[PDB]
Amino acid sequence: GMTQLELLLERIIDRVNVNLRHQKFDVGDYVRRQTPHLHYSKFYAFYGLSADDPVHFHFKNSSLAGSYLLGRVNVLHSALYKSDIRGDELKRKGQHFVCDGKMIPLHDDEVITIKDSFLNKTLVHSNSHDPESPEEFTIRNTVAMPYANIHGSLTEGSFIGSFATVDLSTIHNSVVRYFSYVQTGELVGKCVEPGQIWIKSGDELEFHYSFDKAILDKYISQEAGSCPTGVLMEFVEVRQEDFEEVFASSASGASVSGYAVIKGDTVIGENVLVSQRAYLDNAWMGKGSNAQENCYIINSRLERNCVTAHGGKIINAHLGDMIFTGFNSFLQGSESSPLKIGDGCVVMPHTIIDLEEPLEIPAGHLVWGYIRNKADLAAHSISFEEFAKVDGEVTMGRMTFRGKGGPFLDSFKKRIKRILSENGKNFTFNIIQPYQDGDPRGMYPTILIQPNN
Amino acid sequence: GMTQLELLLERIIDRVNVNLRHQKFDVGDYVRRQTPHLHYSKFYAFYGLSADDPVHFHFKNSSLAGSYLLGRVNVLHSALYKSDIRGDELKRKGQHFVCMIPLHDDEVITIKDSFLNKTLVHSNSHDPESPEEFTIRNTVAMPYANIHGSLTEGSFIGSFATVDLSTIHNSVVRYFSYVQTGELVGKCVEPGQIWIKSGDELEFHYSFDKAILDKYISQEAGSCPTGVLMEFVEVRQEDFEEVFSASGASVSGYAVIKGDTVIGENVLVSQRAYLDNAWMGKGSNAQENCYIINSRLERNCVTAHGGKIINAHLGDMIFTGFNSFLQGSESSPLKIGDGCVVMPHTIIDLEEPLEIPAGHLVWGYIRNKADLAAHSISFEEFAKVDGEVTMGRMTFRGKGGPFLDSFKKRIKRILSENGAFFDGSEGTGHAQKNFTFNIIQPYQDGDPRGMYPTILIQPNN
Ligand SMILES: [Cl-]
Ligand SMILES: [Cl-]
Ligand SMILES: [Cl-]
Ligand SMILES: [Cl-]
Ligand SMILES: [Cl-]
Ligand SMILES: [Cl-]
Prior knowledge:
Strand content of chain A: 35-45%
InterPro entries (chain B): Hexapep_loop, Trimer_LpxA-like_sf
Binding site for Mg(2+) (chain B): 89, 122, 148, 305
GO molecular function (chain B): metal ion binding; transferase activity
CATH topology of the largest domain in chain A: UDP N-Acetylglucosamine Acyltransferase, domain 1
Oligomer: homodimer
CATH class of the largest domain in chain A: Mainly Beta
Keywords (chain B): Metal-binding, Transferase
Bound molecules: chloride ion
């Protein structure tokens, strides 16, 4: 027969597949593996406990192997493998969901509910931005691959590829493939191929970029039945070890999680926030800067007020005042080819800078795509000053934009500003173990954790 | 302002004191301590998970620091410090408590508004008033106490005290006292009393000299237990932390096995058993919290919880009672002949070599031969008794024969259930017929520090 876990996976596969059926996309070989009951029972999982935030966890008929969960989370008939479910931004009862001048009071504390889903090394963060569900950040009938980001995005009946990002969007019965970024409000019954960057707000704003596959695949790709490969993968994996070490484990206004890696000649300035799963190596953090979960900052200097979003990687770079580095960005200079970024620049999500020569980006530029040199930069950037005049359609190679450039640019300024603001929490991670043998091996029993009266 | 744990303890104390108010007994200083929140948060607890037995745990408003829990257990508004709650023998739905009523439900342990310190809870409910519920409520228990098949309520159980197969209500049972009396209501049992009482036609009493007892074990309010017995166990609790091929045999991974220990066939060595240079003959059974050291046990020997055997040679089917301390040495070796029954809370501390003949009943305090004479009797002579007998500090009323058979029946049944008589087919038992201890952690800071949150663990549908 099949073990409970082997059966659990097949049922998830089947539920996801029926929902995705119109996309003729089979998740099976992305999920399915060798005697997982044996692989999974090897692992603990961890749940956060805080004196200051009332606990809620409900784990029912699931596996959690190697996962960390924080906040209020239900895991139902699911399998989470080395994922991070971060419910620290979830709203509380009596708080309001605000929408186009309406305010909807929450009946109950917001929870993250994961149901009939398989999440592999996936980060789930922020909260519900869909007024259909203000009390629940629902992920159901979903598969997500390594280093995916489900950021403030209700997801159902969908597939989220490796290093794919879904941002403040409702995802319904859709495929978002590796290294694709989606911020569209809603994505319904779609198939987004790999290496697409897509922003869409209303009917007067739309940005699209598309990576040359031949180039992208070197950094990240994945084939069904096999796990992801490429530079980005090597990069994160080769460092996961150092994260282990730090788990087992001076500047005014600064906060540095114990759950961050801090390495070499790192200098933490004032008002600097370094969150968990942040990785700093020889990092000079200028006043006001903010490293976020799952970002890497290496042999770099950030002058001031720089925000690095989740999955953001910065190597051998010098950043000025208030640079915003988007999701999953790979900004690699070297010692022979240093990278400079001028004040106020916005580096769009999923930007890959991999220098062959020294490069300096001038202040007040919007940057995207693939950049190795000066020519590439010219083909993959524009100044705020020029772009802010745009009212219509612009094409620059693999990039198209439709709408007003001013408000677009402003959407990014507001976002860094809000992060730097809000930015300016006492808890530990408790162990949870699975069945060690027999049929239920690798499964966790039905567990309900809550506060004492 | 008090923390949640400090407050929890006070609440417990106040409840238990109301129960005990007619005895004017204050449990306060036995329970209470310095910044307990800081101390208890330093510890993990453990719950047993089986693929084979449906899990049930419910922990509400409690601290579990350093404790181990197994089987169907509810812990409510309680503080359990380094205790062992063992529900492995609880009954199941459809089984039949003889008095025959059926159980309509699986039997559950419920501990509520109690404080249990290095206490062993075992067996099940022997009260026909409460067949489906083994309750321990408004109770305080001190180190190395046994609550064995005994419902307790509004009571105090002293250090190394044992309450066996009895319902204990608004009573104080003091240190190293053994009670098996069916029910013990509104009583006060002083230290070092051994009391068995069945119906109206049976009663046994022994009493230790206090000057003597106190050297082995004593406790005063506000302080923890002292004495030889305390130094003995504590000097070894370390070897336990570390730890945490014979036909028909079963040795727990959670047991200590040391030196030149030999595990015979059909041998059952349970968790928290401690063997060191123990030759364990076929059928023998080392239970939780027992110690067997520099000893040879010939066969079918059962050593009850707390039983300690040192530098001894035991024959065939010796029954060593609860919390016994049987110490010989190399210059003073101890021999116990076939079939002997060593009553609960027996203390042998040899000054000279001593051999106990086969088919003897032993109790009390024994260092030499003179003492042995004063503190034992042959089954053959005792079986003749129908009436009253006195032997020094020992008193007996009833029929000696039935009394003896009550012991024999027990060892025999234990052996049997243990699968001591495994032929390779029939006589199958525990030693032949599986879980892990999983961790739980408390709150590490603030107000709730040292507390565990509310946890409900159950099977998947
Ligand atoms: Cl896997
Ligand atoms: Cl919406
Ligand atoms: Cl993909
Ligand atoms: Cl204590
Ligand atoms: Cl104990
Ligand atoms: Cl006492």
